[PDB]
Design a protein around this ligand. Structure first.
Ligand SMILES: NC(=O)C1=CN([C@@H]2O[C@H](COP(=O)(O)OP(=O)(O)OC[C@H]3O[C@@H](n4cnc5c(N)ncnc54)[C@H](OP(=O)(O)O)[C@@H]3O)[C@@H](O)[C@H]2O)C=CC1
Ligand SMILES: [Zn+2]
Lengths: 143, 125, 115, 143, 208, 86, 96, 297
């Protein structure tokens, strides 16, 4: 995604910021700052807020706590950091899902992860790792 | 002889800490996780209070690591969660507290390895 | 309940009175200190600095904290009377040599990762 | 992948803002220049002309900040790479796109049906939990 | 007990226990606890209001007469509601013995000064005020004794950073010594030397 | 002036949200029939006042409380919000 | 085996050498860059491989208490030669 | 941007500001302040000196470990200049002598040396060059000092198009000649002076280093108010409590200070000029054993 861009803004990795991620169960957890972003890279929300203030559409939040308060306003669940329980609304979604009647195609369900050789390189961080390349090379051909 | 005043305790103005190191820091109160390389559990008994990580850079001469913040190496030990929370409030530090995690009881049976029909049968020992 | 042992003041009125006496002493002493230590500042600047340092602790609402601060201020004033300090100790109150840290979001975003 | 792909955090890193020069190549600039160009382009256009795509490693703070920024310019073209069927309830009902039974609650199941999934390489810890329940709770698996 | 183990003396232990019981009987209003260590060291935990009486007793009673004040210090334990712990060490030359008196206090509660009882306490008390921030009432002159003039904070507290907050240098523009926010060329490396697998079962604590 | 999305924050176990819950469990699907394109997000609070957030064009948002509202009350204020009348 | 940087400096045994654009090179003008001429890897690569007729061989680095802690090396693998962990000397069974 | 110069730290003594500055003539009155201001923020300083290394000792404690490198040089050889500015990304020129010498005349000091420095800096890839000349420097001035200054200014502009020319006006300070010269005599009413404080000049130079838009601009550093010579000398003697350099200096002081309102000054760099009344006592306290002079605006 980088070479096709016109302006590149360096962000921070997941080990370089206190950030909130929601896993597949709906549980929200926050990371902690282990190191600081290299060079002139800055936090992502900080970059967005600075760009907003430069453009004149200044955003209400200034610090991380204010951004998390905004997150609470948009969604109540995000602030809780170990709660996983939630309401069961299966009936409503199921009843709304019976309207459209799209058909299935005659194509077998083949996942992208067919073999262990496809598991190592999945995202940007993995593709930039020498260890993952070594693992892929070892899996493809063994000695 | 006794004032009998009713107000929360606050010694912020007596510690001499700079103002930028009081309203900007974010302390963490937690039970440190067990080191996965070892089976000992003696390091997960007391509560620890520690400050957030700040910038470290490489020294232009000799390549050492330099830190501009004084509170980076500070760590405090508390017997219980309430004492640590009280300390954090008294010193006027915003805090994040995480409940202690204890491994759940697990039932282990030697007999299960040599099971007649269940799948807990061991292939080798 | 929440009964506590006093230091000098039973309530806030006595603590305010002690603060007033300490301010009177500092205000009276500022020109003598300026002349004796051969400072480059004026008496107006010294009195303004004394006022700023007094108003820095204006949000304290505990008589024990207030009179402990009064004790510390009295100790520092006594330190200043007997010329126990030097010019550097007096002039550390003004930070004439430190660069002015910015306050707005954009400047702090530009300089570094410091929030 | 979690354990050994931290090495990629030390390679191919974005450290400074970059802009396109006269020849069309990427050159380093300051934060002020890149932010000014992006803010000017954002001010010139408005509405559906602006859009955003969220990657697979972005935190909630950046997501909500970008949502607010593009809402201040009257836009709703906020997209993610992975697709989810929006027909019916879509994303309005939270329980429509979550692992409701949860990883901990997997151990209480007696049968499971996997549809078009390879949990070994898509969620290795989820597959480990399924394997543990299969070994201990005599769980029945169908794929 | 082979020659690698420190020998144990029981007569001194019995004598110290008996004297601790005797002292606690004489002054039941102030003493809260009495302890004798395994290496024959007697310590007495008293109420803060009993600093002047108890000490005076230990200095003047015909059976105690602890004439000398060997040391006076404070210990900071942030996990306690009463943060600071004041320790008095007394030496009795007539009976060739030593005793320890322990008291508790916090940041705002003052402790009555014992200059009247022991003159030697004078500087010691100042030192405490310099290092921990404990205020001593009715002191002849209480001020800093060790730190620099104008120093902000009490260094010996557990929440005070090791390197402090400011550092000194010389500036030629103002032609004087100035103080700046502290910046270290090499940061103090923190080592996690403490290990699992507890070593002393005799000090094991209940699992609450 | 153009509505973009609405959000309903309700507390799962609190009684003040009780009637609001009934609303969904009775008629939310029907509402989704009337607005096949309007996004009505539903989220859970915790010891907080039940609320309804409406976002209009260019980022304007207005919030209305829903404590102790019956199903009729909540559906009424909802139709007031979508209909544009105040 | 001391090499030379493309700029002109000598490369340390750890491979460190300032590139063309590094400003820190200015610290060496009117002075010299301290570099050890004897490389440990080259000096140890030229040691002959010892030939012993035992499955397990003991190494203490020579000198007894003046060497490194005594270790035992297994020589069952005929493909390569057992290498001491501390000293770096090599041992090999008498093939053929 | 050659990562080693990415700014780091909180702008302290041990921080990194990403500035590699070569300060020619740093052992003078202005050089010490410029080097101190550069070093107090973590920038690396290269000091080329022609004098005894003993005379340069006062510059050692103004930087952190390894942040100040001293190098021998001379103006007659281009190789020393090339090896001194080889790695620097900023070159500041403060070389200037107020009197003649049998080895260096005004033409050598103010024309040939700055020209060589600018040409070598351009050849070596230096991106920022700062050159300092007098405010009253005119090609038609009666004195050779200002004519040489004027010629030198043109040469630097020709050799280094992106050079920044700074024009201070009779800098005064703790070690300046402007106040000590007048206080050591122990004629006026038609000549006006516009003295400028030394710290203000140093901060202006530093901000010019930081300012990106000040590439080819020319600045005039002047004080807040103008003083007639007579009453300014009266004030100088009154501060010292005292009752009331061969041929070029008297002529130069006898000239009136020029006015250049089109040229940007200290205010364009975000600096409020400090009046002479605040610092006159600090400068002249050492000449001892209140009614400030009237200004014209
Ligand atoms: N009144 C003022 O001071 C104001 C200054 N001027 C200009 O500002 C600049 C610096 O001013 P200032 O610091 O006060 O002057 P100084 O005389 O105090 O310093 C001159 C510096 O330049 C060096 N230098 C002088 N001559 C030579 C030479 N022939 N060869 C090599 N190096 C030389 C000196 O080194 P060394 O000591 O070893 O000889 C010294 O380091 C000068 O260019 C001056 O013209 C601008 C307006 C007036
Ligand atoms: Zn060996």
């Amino acid at each position: 995604g980088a070479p096709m861009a016109d302006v590149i803004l360096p962000g921070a990795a997941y080990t370089e910021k206190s950030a909130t991620y929601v896993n597949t169960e709906g549980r929200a957890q926050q990371t902690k700052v282990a190191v600081t972003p290299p060079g002139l890279a800055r936090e992502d929300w900080k970059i967005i807020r600075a760009l907003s203030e430069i453009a004149g559409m200044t955003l209400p939040y200034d610090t991380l706590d204010q951004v998390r308060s905004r997150l609470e306003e948009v969604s109540p669940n995000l602030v809780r950091y170990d709660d996983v329980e939630g309401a069961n609304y299966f009936q409503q979604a199921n009843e709304l899902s019976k309207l459209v009647n799209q058909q299935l195609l005659a194509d077998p369900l083949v996942p992208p992860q067919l073999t262990i050789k496809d598991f190592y390189m999945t995202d940007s961080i993995s593709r930039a790792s020498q260890t993952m390349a070594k693992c892929v090379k070892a899996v493809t051909e063994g000695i | 002889q006794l004032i009998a005043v009713d107000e929360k305790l606050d010694i912020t103005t007596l510690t001499g800490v700079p103002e930028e190191h009081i309203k900007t820091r974010k302390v963490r109160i937690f039970v440190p996780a067990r080191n996965n390389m070892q089976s000992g559990v003696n390091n997960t008994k007391k509560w620890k209070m520690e400050f957030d990580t700040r910038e470290r850079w490489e020294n232009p001469l000799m390549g050492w690591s330099s830190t501009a913040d004084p509170l980076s190496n500070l760590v405090l030990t508390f017997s219980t969660k309430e004492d640590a929370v009280a300390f954090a409030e008294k010193n006027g530090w915003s805090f994040d507290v995480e409940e202690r995690k204890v491994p759940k009881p697990k039932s282990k049976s030697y007999g299960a390895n040599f099971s007649w029909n269940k799948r807990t049968r061991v292939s080798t020992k | 309940g929440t009964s506590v042992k006093p230091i000098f003041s039973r309530d806030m009125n006595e603590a305010k009175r002690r603060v007033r006496e300490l301010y009177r002493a500092w205000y009276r002493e500022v020109p003598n200190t300026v002349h004796l230590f051969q400072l480059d500042i004026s008496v107006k600047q010294g009195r303004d600095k004394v006022r700023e340092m007094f108003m820095k602790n204006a949000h304290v609402t505990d008589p024990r904290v207030v009179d402990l601060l009064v004790i510390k201020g009295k100790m520092e004033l006594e330190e200043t009377i007997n010329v126990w300090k030097q010019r550097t100790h007096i002039m550390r109150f003004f930070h004439e040599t430190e660069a002015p840290r910015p306050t707005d979001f954009l400047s702090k975003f530009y300089v570094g990762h410091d929030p | 992948k979690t354990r050994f792909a931290y090495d990629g955090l030390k390679r191919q890193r974005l450290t400074q803002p970059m802009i396109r020069n006269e020849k069309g190549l990427l050159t380093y600039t300051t934060w002020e220049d890149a932010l000014s160009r992006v803010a000017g382009m954002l001010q010139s256009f408005q509405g559906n002309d602006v859009a955003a795509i969220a990657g697979g490693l972005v935190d909630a703070e950046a997501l909500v900040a970008l949502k607010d920024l593009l809402n201040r310019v009257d836009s709703d073209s906020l997209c993610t790479e992975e697709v989810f069927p929006t027909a019916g309830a879509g994303t309005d009902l939270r329980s429509n796109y979550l692992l409701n039974t949860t990883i901990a609650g997997v151990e209480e199941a007696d049968v499971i049906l996997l549809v078009g999934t390879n949990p070994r390489f898509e969620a290795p810890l989820f597959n480990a939990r399924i394997r543990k329940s299969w070994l201990h709770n005599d769980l029945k698996v169908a794929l | 007990t082979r020659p690698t183990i420190r020998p144990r003396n029981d007569v001194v232990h019995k004598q110290l226990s008996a004297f601790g019981q005797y002292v606690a009987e004489i002054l039941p209003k102030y003493v809260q606890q009495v302890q004798v260590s395994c290496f024959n060291e007697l310590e007495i935990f008293i109420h803060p209001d009993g600093v002047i009486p108890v000490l005076t007793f230990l200095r003047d009673h015909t059976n105690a007469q602890f004439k000398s004040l060997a040391d006076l210090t404070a210990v900071d334990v942030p996990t306690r509601q009463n943060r600071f712990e004041i320790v008095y060490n007394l030496l009795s030359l007539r009976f060739n013995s030593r005793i320890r008196v322990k008291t508790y206090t916090d940041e705002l509660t003052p402790i009555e000064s014992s200059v009247t009882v022991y003159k030697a306490a004078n500087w010691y008390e100042r030192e405490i005020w310099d290092m921990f921030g404990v205020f001593f009432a009715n002191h002849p002159d209480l001020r800093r004794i060790l730190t620099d003039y104008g120093f902000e904070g009490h260094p010996f507290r557990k929440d005070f950073p090791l390197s402090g907050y400011v550092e000194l240098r010389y500036d030629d523009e103002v032609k004087r010594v100035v103080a700046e926010p502290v910046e270290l060329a090499q940061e103090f490396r923190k080592f996690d030397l403490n290990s699992p697998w507890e070593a002393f079962p005799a000090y094991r604590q209940p699992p609450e | 002036l153009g509505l973009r999305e609405i959000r309903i924050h309700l507390c799962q176990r609190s009684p003040g949200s009780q009637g609001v819950r009934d609303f969904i469990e009775k008629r939310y699907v029907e509402l989704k029939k009337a607005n096949p394109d309007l996004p009505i997000l539903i989220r859970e609070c915790s010891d907080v006042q039940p609320k309804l957030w409406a976002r209009y064009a260019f980022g304007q948002e207005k919030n209305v409380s829903l404590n102790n509202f019956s199903a009729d009350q909540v559906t009424r204020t909802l139709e007031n919000v979508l209909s544009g009348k105040a | 085996g001391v090499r030379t940087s493309p700029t002109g400096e000598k490369v340390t045994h750890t491979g460190q050498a300032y590139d063309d654009g590094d400003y820190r090179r200015v610290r060496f003008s009117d002075r010299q860059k301290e570099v050890n001429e004897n490389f440990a890897i080259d000096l140890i690569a030229e040691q002959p491989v010892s030939e012993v007729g035992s499955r397990v061989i003991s190494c203490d680095g020579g000198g007894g208490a003046l060497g490194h802690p005594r270790v035992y090396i297994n020589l069952d693998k005929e493909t390569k030669t057992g290498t001491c962990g501390y000293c770096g000397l090599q041992f090999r069974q008498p093939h053929h | 941007l050659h990562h080693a110069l990415i700014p780091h730290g909180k702008g302290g003594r041990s921080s990194v500001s990403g500035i590699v500055a070569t300060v020619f003539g740093a052992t003078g009155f202005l050089g010490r302040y410029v080097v101190n201001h550069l070093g107090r923020m973590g920038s690396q300083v290269i000091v080329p000196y022609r004098c005894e290394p003993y005379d340069t000792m006062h510059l050692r404690p103004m930087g952190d470990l390894g942040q100040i490198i001293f190098m021998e040089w001379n103006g007659k050889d281009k190789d020393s200049i090339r090896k001194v500015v080889e790695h620097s990304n900023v070159v500041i020129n403060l070389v200037g002598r107020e009197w003649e010498t049998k080895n260096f005349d005004f033409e050598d000091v103010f024309v040939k040396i700055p020209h060589a420095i600018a040409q070598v800096s351009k050849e070596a890839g230096v991106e920022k060059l700062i050159h300092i000349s007098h405010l009253n420097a005119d090609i038609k001035s009666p004195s050779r000092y200002l004519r040489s200054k004027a010629v030198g200014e043109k040469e630097v502009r020709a050799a280094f198009p992106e050079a920044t020319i700074i024009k201070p006006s009779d800098i005064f300070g703790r070690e300046d000649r402007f106040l000590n010269y007048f206080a050591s005599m122990r004629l006026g009413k038609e000549t006006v002076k516009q003295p400028v404080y030394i710290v203000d000049v140093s901060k202006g130079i530093i901000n010019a280093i930081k300012d990106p838009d000040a590439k080819g601009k020319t600045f005039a550093f002047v004080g807040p108010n103008r003083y007639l010579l007579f009453d300014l000398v009266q004030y100088i003697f009154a501060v010292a409590y005292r009752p009331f350099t061969t041929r070029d200096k008297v002529e130069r002081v006898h000239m009136s200070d020029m006015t250049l309102p089109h040229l940007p000054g200290l205010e364009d760099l975000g600096i409020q000029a400090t009046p002479l009344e605040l610092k006159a006592i600090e400068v002249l306290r050492r000449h001892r054993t209140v009614k400030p002079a009237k200004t014209v605006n």
